[PDB]
Amino acid sequence: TANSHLGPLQISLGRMLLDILKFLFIYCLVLLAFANGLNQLYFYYETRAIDEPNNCKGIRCEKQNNAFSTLFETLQSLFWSVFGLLNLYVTNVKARHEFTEFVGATMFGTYNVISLVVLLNMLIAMMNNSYQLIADHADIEWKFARTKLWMSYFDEGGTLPPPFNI
Amino acid sequence: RIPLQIVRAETELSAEEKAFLNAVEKGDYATVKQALQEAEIYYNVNINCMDPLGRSALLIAIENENLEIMELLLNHSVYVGDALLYAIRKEVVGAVELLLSYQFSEFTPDITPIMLAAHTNNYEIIKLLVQKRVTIPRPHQIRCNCVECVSSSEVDSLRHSRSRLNIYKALASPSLIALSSEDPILTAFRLGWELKELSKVENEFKAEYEELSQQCKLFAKDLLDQARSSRELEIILNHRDDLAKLKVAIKYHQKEFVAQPNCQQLLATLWYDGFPGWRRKHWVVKLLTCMTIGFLFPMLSIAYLISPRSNLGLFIKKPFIKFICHTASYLTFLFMLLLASQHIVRTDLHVQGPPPTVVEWMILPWVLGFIWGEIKEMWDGGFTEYIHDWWNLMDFAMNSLYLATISLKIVAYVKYNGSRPREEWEMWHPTLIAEALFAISNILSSLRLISLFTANSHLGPLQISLGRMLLDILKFLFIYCLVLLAFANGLNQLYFYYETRAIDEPNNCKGIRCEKQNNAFSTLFETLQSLFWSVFGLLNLYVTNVKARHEFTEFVGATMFGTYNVISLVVLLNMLIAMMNNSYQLIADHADIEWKFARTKLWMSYFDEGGTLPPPFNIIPDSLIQNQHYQEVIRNLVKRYVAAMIRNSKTHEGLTEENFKELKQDISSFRYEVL
Amino acid sequence: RIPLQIVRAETELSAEEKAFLNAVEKGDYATVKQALQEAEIYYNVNINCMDPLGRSALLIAIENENLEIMELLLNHSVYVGDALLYAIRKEVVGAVELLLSYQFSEFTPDITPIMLAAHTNNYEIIKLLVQKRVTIPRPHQIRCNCVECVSSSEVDSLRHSRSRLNIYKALASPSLIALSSEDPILTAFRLGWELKELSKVENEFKAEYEELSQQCKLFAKDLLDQARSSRELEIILNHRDDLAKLKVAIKYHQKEFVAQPNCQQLLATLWYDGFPGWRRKHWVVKLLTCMTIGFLFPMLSIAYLISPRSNLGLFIKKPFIKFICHTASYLTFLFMLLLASQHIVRTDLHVQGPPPTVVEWMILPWVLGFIWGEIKEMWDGGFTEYIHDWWNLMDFAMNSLYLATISLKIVAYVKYNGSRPREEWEMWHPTLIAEALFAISNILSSLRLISLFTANSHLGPLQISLGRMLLDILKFLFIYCLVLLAFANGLNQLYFYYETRAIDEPNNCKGIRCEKQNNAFSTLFETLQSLFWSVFGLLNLYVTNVKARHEFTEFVGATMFGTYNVISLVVLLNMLIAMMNNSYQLIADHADIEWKFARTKLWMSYFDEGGTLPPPFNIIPDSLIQNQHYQEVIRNLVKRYVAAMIRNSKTHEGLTEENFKELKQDISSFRYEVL
Amino acid sequence: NLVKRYVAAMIRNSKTHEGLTEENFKELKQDISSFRYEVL
Amino acid sequence: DLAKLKVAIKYHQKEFVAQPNCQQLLATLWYDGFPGWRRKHWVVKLL
Ligand SMILES: CC(C)CCC[C@@H](C)[C@H]1CC[C@H]2[C@@H]3CC=C4C[C@@H](OC(=O)CCC(=O)O)CC[C@]4(C)[C@H]3CC[C@]12C
Ligand SMILES: CC(C)CCC[C@@H](C)[C@H]1CC[C@H]2[C@@H]3CC=C4C[C@@H](OC(=O)CCC(=O)O)CC[C@]4(C)[C@H]3CC[C@]12C
Ligand SMILES: CC(C)CCC[C@@H](C)[C@H]1CC[C@H]2[C@@H]3CC=C4C[C@@H](OC(=O)CCC(=O)O)CC[C@]4(C)[C@H]3CC[C@]12C
């Protein structure tokens, strides 16, 4: 805030943070719904770490497995699928249950569409709308913030820096 | 180098006619008199002479708003046809009264003086005309096949449409409505609805009908803002042709009427029945009261069942308490659904037909209550209204899935008796199908919780805006689907010659859901799935390679895939983003009105006494005086609105013109007195 | 329940003073006379009485623009102080002439009549004042340490700043400039430059100085638009204090002056020297002429070297031909660079110090020509201007890389003699370093081709807009770098305990550029690289796992990585997109002016006769009469501009006030004549 | 001082075309009526 | 010492605080030991 070029930008970003927090609620509700559904579908096919290669279990292994066996793991998998770090073979069970595998794949695809095609674009649109209004009064807010920052060094209390103030 | 001439020459009048027109325009009470005498005697002047710009002497006098010359000409029997319309358009009460006291035109031949006055919206001239027992034609139904309508549409469609539009524009006049209607609010509601419905049948003249409907809605609202007392507001809102007028306004989509601050205060007072000074409390104590009232939902309900007249039994009849209890019940149902898929309560995954567990036994009554409530609401309240909600579709799908799950479980329990390894079950085992349907219904039931966002001041408008953008998302889906189908057809045609069996693949896995993806374009279904999954980057690049060394075919397939990727990810998504931004820009203006309309609709569903108990517990087995009061209040509101609009009509241009005319009249009078 | 009173009471005047003020306001040539007589004799009235709203009788008369009372009061010796300023502000020439004929204020005590007239921009009053030999103070340099400036800034900074702003606002008046300057265009250029430079030193009053500079630029442009002949335009543009005035305008950043249509036509006529009717031809034939002229670039240059006076040798002296030849030469150089890295011309990749190949031998003269041209341009044309281009930086980097490559090749050839397998060479082999530098310089030289886009009507504005957004991209880079450093520090601190040697890893590969990524967070450099590459999704999720079973540490690392991913990819990029949109919205308005300024700057570099030959071939070894003409044209332009502005000054409010005052005067005269 | 300056500035800003036109029209009407009465 | 300015800050008077005359006074107080700070070049200020 002490700089003439970065201060207004920082104020604007801090002003948009609240609306980011607003979208977080809807995203969390959608995530919880789909996690509940996927865990309910897939909890019958849990496997122990002994039978997996390298004795590794979860989605942080080189060969991802047991992605939807527990609610916590399902939440983590659905979070990491936002950035594309979950592979497509995690929807396959060891047995040949093609109906179950297809239903799980359709659930995953619907979640991907809803999360990555709709919600993010709506977030971008309302970010643009918020910034349009915020950009008008950037100077006044930045100068108010800089005045508040300056006034904290006028008084004579706490003159010494923390290494020397004890 | 070509000269300019006059092609459509106008037949000029003689010097006598030019002098007469000049004298009439300038103003000479004696020169015009002697000119009329000369026209009478020697016929030197035509009494019906016309300006080349279609402006007779009477029209010149009318535009000069001097009444002496007009009265003299009327006494001299000049052609007076189509002059009352000019007087009305100029909005001169004295001249209108004068003509009412007894070729080329600027008005279409279907326009009447009353219709023209209504188009102008001048209360003084409309009242003067209506005082003489005038009438206005009323048009036929929107979809009418009568011979007269068919013949009129078959002879002159332009004339027919113009006449209909003129009649509706006259009927939609606020001053005419206030003067001639006994229920102006109801008339405005119905007229706005009819104009809105007509705008989509006459698609060519859509904007005119839209503006007329907006005018009617604005008139109704502005009439509502003239209430000065809670008693007057209650008289207006409770008038039955308990809040009958508010229900009618909701039915007719009067969002600005419903979202007015005086109505919202009354609705909030009704909503917070048992919490006087609710907005006085702190958010922390309000939150804690919410939690405590929520936890006591099993009680307050048994109390209502065993003693409705008791002090405890009358608590659940309040709307806010009822809403909190229903929300707590739904949250409990969702918590049990969460408990269903855990290790604590469900074990022994090896039985073919399993008896229901304790969690499923607990779940069943909630499902029965949901189905019973849906059926009861659909019966009592209107069948055609039940489908115009877009949430009842989700309710229907969820309940159908639950019913199918229960039926499949019963069928499996009846048919199968024993145990068998799950790995050797068939593809279409009833237990597997029931599990899949249960999971899908769980997803839907969890997603239902969105509709409770409209009750909050921060999430409601956002939810309304997203629901408004969904339609344009649906619009883009069509183009995307067509492009996807085209490219899938091409890729499948290219690659269908190189299909391989699952035996020769590693792990005996075939498709793109294997660890090593293969046969991505061997069938149309698989090609569609692959092209769908390539949108998110989950398809690898080696799927375009065939086992043989056909480099031309592999390159053509890779180029097809690259062109599809470019078109889908570089063009269509960015266009979607752009039009999302454009839609949100317009949507953000009216978010408050739409959110308040939605919240009013949500609140009004808890006012009635039907369906008080939540689903778990709901399966256990004078007029004349009111008319006079309404008429008095309507009189007061109309008088106040007319006075306010008249005082608002004072404008600089009108005041300057009036002062100039008055100064000219006084100067002329003083000059005449001096002379 | 507290009463309202008057706290800052005003000392009222007596009934005599109130009556005198009422008579003065109403207007009574005799009543005011007898009141002044009474004040003279009995002292019943104060001649210096003041309205409670600081409005003396003279001020009332001035606001009433009646001169008889003012003349009588002046004859009666009333306090006349600070009345000329009110007359000037009201802009009444008759009253201004009257006062020029011989406490509380609304004006700051530093304001002079000439400064106030200049603030008003009234030509008639400014001329009247300047006719009486008035002066205006001139301020000190922008950065001045003289004692008088230091003392003034140390006593009253508010007064000092207000006085400086008032002086500059007076000096920036178009009417004052036109009246008192002999070179209004040059004066406007210099004043706009000074105000623009001052706006960033007085950062508090930035907008005022910006508006003053914009006013000066607008005045200069509008003066230019008053030319009626090509001879007048050439006289204006070629005036030397060959296009000296245009070069000065370019130096002072006068974009609206340069982009005016009359100037652009002259520049285009100069640019298309050898193609009369170039815009008459079809785009196909123009394109074919471009290709043929491009292919003949080796000729037209040898012809210019061996016979400058010949018909063939004079062709390359035209600007468009010179531009085409330079472009063709650069394209040939780039084609040879492309040929350098092919299988046809380069073989035997096993020699330590290799002699230069034929392609490198051909490449060397182009590099020598580029360096020689850069040095020659930097010497001849100004050293400080050479750095304000932002393309000369790319030129310098590219030529430095080429020089380093040549030096390293020579050093390697001298030092090494023999052959050795490339797999056992050291890390810092001179041949390897030279190859890397050559590749980087190839990238830079290929990227240089962007600067030719400004010559096209479709790509130029787009290139200007992108170059305008680059600065705000640079602004976001800082915040991104800080966040990246914070998270890299945290992750390296968490994970530095689990480093492993390359021996124990498969294939003896260590880092994230291996097929199995490992040691992603073992060092700070590797952590920075991993966090950079995770922006594009090229880092796998198993890099957060340690070889031991430390689940708490692995979970903490995964949560750190997830938080970084959310912050970087969900928040910062979307904010960047939003502010990109906001910047482009404002940039898109003035794209044409900026593009035409850039194209003019590009065109003007080919007009001079220095550096005619392309780099491959450029290493082979009266004043008084002009002043009178300019003065005459300036007289004509100033007269036309003043007349146009005066005719534009006719406004409805002014005309209405003038007509009202004239009618009042005539009515009063007629009433007096009757009486 | 500040209140006096602010009030004077706002009063001088209150001068508007509509108000000035209405005032001039009323004053002209009054003067015309006075002249007519004097003549009569 | 700037009691009224502190009250204005407490009451969120952003337009009052950001006025140019107040900002000049605040800058004068802020640059106590560097008279003519804005006169210097950015390089020497940085050093
Ligand atoms: C992106 C990387 C390089 C960050 C490295 C961390 C630090 C070296 C940076 C981070 C934030 C920087 C600060 C950001 C802003 C300012 C205010 C700045 O004050 C002004 O610019 C005063 C003049 C004006 O108002 O323009 C003085 C440097 C300082 C403290 C900077 C000092 C260096 C800091 C601490
Ligand atoms: C994102 C995760 C935590 C969702 C978890 C599911 C439930 C715990 C949430 C989802 C939606 C929530 C509801 C959303 C909105 C409201 C309205 C709210 O009413 C008000 O805010 C009234 C006062 C006002 O108008 O501001 C009362 C809580 C309630 C029912 C919430 C109760 C808790 C619910 C059911
Ligand atoms: C995208 C690929 C094909 C680039 C290949 C590199 C070159 C073949 C291109 C890159 C930029 C091009 C230049 C961009 C713009 C111009 C200006 C252009 O001039 C006009 O258009 C003048 C008429 C007008 O003002 O519209 C003449 C061609 C030229 C030099 C182009 C010549 C061909 C160049 C060097």
Ligand SMILES: [Ca+2]
């Ligand atoms: Ca329902």
Ligand SMILES: [Ca+2]
């Ligand atoms: Ca250069």
Ligand SMILES: [Zn+2]
């Ligand atoms: Zn009909």
Ligand SMILES: [Zn+2]
């Ligand atoms: Zn000085």
